């Protein structure tokens, strides 16, 4: 629908939708921008990510409420299936954008890592509702692992995209892959390597890094 709007206007409107907490609009605007065919800037990648994370986040939270009602106990099943189908469509939409053609056109390591992390995240969301499920778990693991390999070669241990990747990969291992010791080992080594690197950072970079490290520590606390 957004094909007749200028790229710059779509980006501006995505920023306004964020301020208005209109995340479905935000995602539609950023989808439009992606489909203009130009690579995305760092700020634009973040806008894309924030929009769809909030949309799918609301769907996941709804799905969990309905699934828990369903299990205690046709309407509940029927309405969970409806929400589940909507969530799968959103994930398919994101993965479609990544595959046509954000990833292949991502020359830089930081762009390619960002998009591969997203691919893992949206397969992860698909895995949460899947039962085939095995194929989806493997697709998530492979995307995450390819992002890790690039990130370890090309980015420092405190880089916020590398840290956010390692955080989410560790959650995958713990929540999806039934590999809690893998999750704990990844979070711990990620945390220690970033810690030993904080001395190189400005006050701004320091704030970025220690914010995500706190999430890693929180999970290690819940997991052990």
């Amino acid at each position: 629908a957004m094909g007749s709007m200028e790229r710059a206007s779509l980006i501006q409107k995505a920023k306004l939708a964020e301020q208005a907490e209109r995340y479905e609009d935000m995602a539609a605007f950023m989808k439009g921008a992606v489909e203009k065919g130009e690579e995305l800037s760092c700020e634009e990648r973040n806008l894309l990510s924030v929009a769809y994370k909030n949309v799918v986040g609301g769907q996941r939270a709804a799905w969990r409420v309905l699934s828990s009602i369903e299990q205690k106990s046709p309407e509940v099943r029927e309405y969970r299936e409806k929400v589940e189908t909507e969530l799968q469509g959103v994930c398919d939409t994101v993965l479609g954008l990544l595959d046509s053609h954000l990833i292949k056109e991502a020359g830089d390591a930081e762009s390619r890592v960002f998009y591969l992390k997203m691919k893992g995240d949206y397969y992860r969301y698909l895995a949460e509702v899947a039962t085939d499920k095995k194929r989806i778990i493997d697709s998530a693991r492979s995307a995450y692992q390819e992002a890790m390999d690039i990130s370890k070669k090309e980015m420092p241990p405190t880089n916020p995209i590398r840290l956010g990747l390692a955080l989410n990969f560790s959650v995958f291992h713990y929540e999806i892959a039934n590999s809690p010791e893998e999750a704990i080992s990844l979070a711990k080594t990620t945390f220690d390597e970033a810690m030993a690197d904080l001395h190189t950072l400005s006050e701004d970079s320091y704030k970025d890094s220690t914010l995500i490290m706190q999430l890693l520590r929180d999970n290690l606390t819940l997991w052990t």
Binding site: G164, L167, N168, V171, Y174, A183, L215, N219
Partner: peptide
């Protein structure tokens, strides 16, 4: 478990 916010 908490993921990247």
């Amino acid at each position: 478990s908490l993921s990247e916010r």
